[PDB]
Amino acid sequence: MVKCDPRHGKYMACCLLYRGDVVPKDVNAAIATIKTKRSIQFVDWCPTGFKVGINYQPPTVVPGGDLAKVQRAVCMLSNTTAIAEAWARLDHKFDLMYAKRAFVHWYVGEGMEEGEFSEAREDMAALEKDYEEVGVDSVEGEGEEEGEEY
Amino acid sequence: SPGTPGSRSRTPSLPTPPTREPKKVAVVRTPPKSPSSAKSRLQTAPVPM
Questions:
Q1: Do β-strands A72-80 and A50-55 pair in parallel, antiparallel, or remain unpaired?
Q2: Pick from A72, A14, A68: nearest CA to A41
Q3: Is A145 among the domain residues?
Q4: Which of A82, A111, A132 is the C-terminal boundary of a domain?
Q5: Among A25, A46, A143, B9, which has the highest number of CB atoms less than 10 A from its own CB?
Q6: Quick one: closest CA in A to B22, which residue?
Q7: A141 lies within 8 A of chain B by CB
């Protein structure tokens, strides 16, 4: 439920929150099978990939429209380095506009110093590289090989 | 510029947008804080005769 693709990046951590008719033993078995299916990718050095949550309350819906009532449910929340592709797309669309300086008269008009909307952008360019430098191998010094596997 | 007799049109054309400028922007800045460690251990049971 954001457009960036969780296979372009890698998950860094997860949380799995369950409702209703639930078996901890089938949750165990499914998580362990997700850790087995490496089509779902996480980064290597975050071994305990998951937080688990399990509540008794059934699922719950409003009458007169929308979703139909169910007897068990799941929410899944996960940090990823693919968030960086959607932020890089937002920030390029900043650069394209800022290279003509469109819009930045309203931003001065209603208060902002121009050096602060200059600093934001290099901070978001730093964000692209904070998220790039976590998408790395079992290496802290120098030494990476040019072969890629993901 | 030479041209027709009498009044001639009065045209400015200085383009407002900034040109190419020094903002490269995309440079590595903050890698995550990452120390390597070589580590060692030495087995130390009772060793009488």
A1: unpaired
A2: A14
A3: no
A4: A82
A5: A46
A6: A99
A7: yes
Report d(CA A22, CA B49) in Å as an integer. Answer: 60
| Residue A9 neighbours by CB distance under 10 Å | 22
- Which of B22, B27, B32, B25 has the alpha carbon at shortest distance from A119? B25
Single out the residue of A116, A142, A127 nearest to residue B29, CA to CA: A127
B17–chain A nearest CA distance, Å: 5
- Segments forming the whole domain that contains residue A87: 83-140
Contact B29 A100 (CB under 8 A): no
Task: Count how many domains chain A has.
Answer: 2
- Which residues of chain B are at the A interface, by a Cβ-Cβ cutoff of 8 Å? 17-18, 21, 25-32, 34-36
Residue A149 belongs to a domain: no
Resolution (A): 4.1
Report how this structure was experimentally obtained: cryo-EM
End-to-end CA distance of chain B: 112
At B20, list the tokens.
């190419």
Q: From A82, A105, A121, give the residue that closes a domain.
A: A82
A73 plus A102 within the same structural domain: no
CATH of the domain at A105: 1.10.287.600
Q: Which of residues 82-101 of A touch B (CB under 8 A)?
A: 95, 99-101
